[PDB]
Amino acid sequence: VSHLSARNIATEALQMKKLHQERGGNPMLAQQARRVLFATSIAGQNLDARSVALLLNTAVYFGMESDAKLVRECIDYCLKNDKLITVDVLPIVVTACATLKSRDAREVIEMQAQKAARNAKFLDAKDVTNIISAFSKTGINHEKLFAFLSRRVQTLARVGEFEAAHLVILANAFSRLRYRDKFLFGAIARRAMSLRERVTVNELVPLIVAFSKIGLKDPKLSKRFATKAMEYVDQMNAEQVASMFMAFAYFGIRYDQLFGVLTNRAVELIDEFNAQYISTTLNAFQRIGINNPELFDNLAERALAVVQDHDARDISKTVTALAHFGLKDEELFKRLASHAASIADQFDAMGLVNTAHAFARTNFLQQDMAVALSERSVYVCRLLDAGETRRLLWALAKFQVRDPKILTPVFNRCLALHYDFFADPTGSEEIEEIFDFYGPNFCPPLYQLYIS
Amino acid sequence: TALDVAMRVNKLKRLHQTGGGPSGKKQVELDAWRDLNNLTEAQINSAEGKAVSLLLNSWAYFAKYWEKGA
Amino acid sequence: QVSDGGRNAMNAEPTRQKLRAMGEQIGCRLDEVEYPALPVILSILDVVVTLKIYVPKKCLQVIFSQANDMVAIVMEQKDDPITAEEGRQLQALLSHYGNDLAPELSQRMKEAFREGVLPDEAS
């Protein structure tokens, strides 16, 4: 590997990333790429902008942080030579700097945003999609650039210069940024309709998912999407079935003729369901509101054999969905509680509160999960809303927890947001339960606020 | 200090580079060896950069002509 | 924003006229202002020419005389950013409205083209 110059290293790093993010995650390719990229330096050699951008991208993708040398040298080069970063290597730099969060990364992202804003009128079919996806990866709120790019996308799509993959990328990129524009999504839908047979199921499912996520509240296109998807049910995979379940729960409109066929196909492939698919299906059923015990029994049974496969998110969603519908499965609940006790350090800020409240709402108390979640609450108290804090406090009061080292953070958080805490009517009953346990002695100022 | 012995050794090395001197180049090498080994801990513990650089230059230059490595 | 083949297509032409009328009200009082930079003058003149507003000759003479000092400063000082395309546009506008308005500006401006003081847009 020593006789390879920096250009060949960049090409092979791009090849390794493409092989790893697409054809399996072989833990061998990742570690070999890490070892090779740990001993490379852009120093004393003249390199093109594209090679430096490729090295930065493939380094950052493989875990390298903003403290590594290669990353620092590439970022310094991107800062010093700004006019050499044309509109062809702008997406690579932006994608690489998306996850890096430092001063130089912010400055580079802003400079590339302004450059793409100025040249938004002279881009072609590839560049608009690549740039908009790259800017959707990072969290930026440059509205004017989005407007210019949407205008250019409409102008290009009027003449018909987009394929199925381009449509999926554009729809996902514009849905991820929460940019609600009716004309742009209408144009994308019309371009897909003109494409006709060139969109297959694999290129159709993400379109529906993104169109539901954006939330246009247009019942004219939802029906057309449902009718188009009705013919493709027999070819779908289990993951696709769960994806359309979630998408048509996001839409909010009831299509019984579609839901029945979806349920039949889901029952057909019950052996291929992982825990993620079961959690997604149960969350979609909770959101849409339909109550179908026949599929629910099979989903609960299949969830019982893949208990070890459950993540924190899957446990949270499954338990909340099961508790909302009033389904009792003592073995599944016990196994899920034990597993949640095992991985208590993987719960995020809101997943912990949802899991604790779902477990406390039904009469199921287990010390193994209770102690773990109560201890873990300290590190997620600071990232909570008023209603979420109220739910967590009620669940903790139901578990009979009295350790001050646990109760001080949640009481501080609920005192800091007292106005929104006491202005939510739906939780009023819960309030009267909480102070029924702790009493006026615990945090007197909160009691004084409660009396007023 | 050590700068004086350094510059005198440099003068010897220039003399060897140009010609051989009245006594001969081998005698010059012997005198350079003695002057270089004259240095003790006091000066080399208080020598600045130029003197050390010149001493290494002269010693490396004379190591090619000496039969032993040194 | 007016469509010649929309729902109110038959009402398109009168509305256009109205707009032109309210342009002239602004166009008549175009000599009291003081232009800081050439792009302001060029934008105003592009708007009036494209939309075919009528402007009295006095304001035109004031505009061209004001632009003359700026182009002369740019030509003479050369130490201080009028690009070449902007200068072309100004020359063409003066030619369209007649070179009798400002005889000095035409000759100075042509000489600027001949020498090459004005840079390009790429630079």
């Binding site: 990333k17 790893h20 993010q21 995650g25 990742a30 570690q31 070999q32 890490r34 070892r35 740990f38 001993a39 993708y61 493989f62 875990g63 942080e65 903003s66 403290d67 590594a68 040398k69 994608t95 998306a98 996850t99 430092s102 001063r103 130089d104 990866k137 993620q276 993540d311 998110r313 899957d314 | - | -």
Partner: protein, 314 residues
Amino acid sequence: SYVLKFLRGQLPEDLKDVNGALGCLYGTLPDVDEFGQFVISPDVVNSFHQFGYVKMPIPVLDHQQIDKLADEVNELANNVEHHPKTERLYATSLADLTGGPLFFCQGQWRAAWGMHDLIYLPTITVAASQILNNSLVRLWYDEVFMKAARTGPCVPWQQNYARWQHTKPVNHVTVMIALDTMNKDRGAPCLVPGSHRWREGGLLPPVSYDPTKDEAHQLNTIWEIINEEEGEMLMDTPPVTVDLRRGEALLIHPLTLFATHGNRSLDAVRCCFIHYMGEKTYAVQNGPLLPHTTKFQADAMIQGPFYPVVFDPA
């Protein structure tokens, strides 16, 4: 769950969750039947058990590896663009956002590549296991010392086991590796021979630390904590300073007296400690042994993701 297409190859937020060792410094760990190459001679073991300390005959790292490790240590103390994963550290001298003439870091094996890899280095872990009577050896914690040039201070006499009173049995060892060439004018380690067997394996009283004072008094405070017999053994065997190269390693008993000199060269000096602990080790109280770590109860065996097993004689 579902990991996004551009986040598939990332590493965990902290390197503690990474099972095994990354291939960064020396590639992959050798096979099960390939761990006999790194064994050490019995005479080194006898020298350690006699003097309380010993030096490994061979440097444990190539010079490129030492350069990379020095770069990591330099980046751990940026003070303008703070290190990522700084919140994964047990303690730092930059918690005040100002630093100083001495930078000390702990628990950095969960923060940077290479430092995590250095823990599972075969040459040192096999030696430490041999010192610990061929048992499973678990990392206790690491430490990094960086002293500035022309003003770097010196840490006075101390005993390592004085800081580990919350741990019940005496089953430990320390390995110190030099990331820069060291000598008595820049942070050399000075140890007293035969001091680990003075107070019947006991702990001497802590020394009085008075900063803003010359190095001579700081290193001469030793005559205040010892008794007459320890004074006689000191007179027979005065403390010895050890010179270290850019990669040489030194094994120290937990109970031997230990100090480091000041830095009077023209560049900063770096060194790294790693403390290794035996299998049969229990806790004494209820709670976490280190800030924000798994909590133990009564005499519980010390395991978990925070004390990984680095080597197994089976």
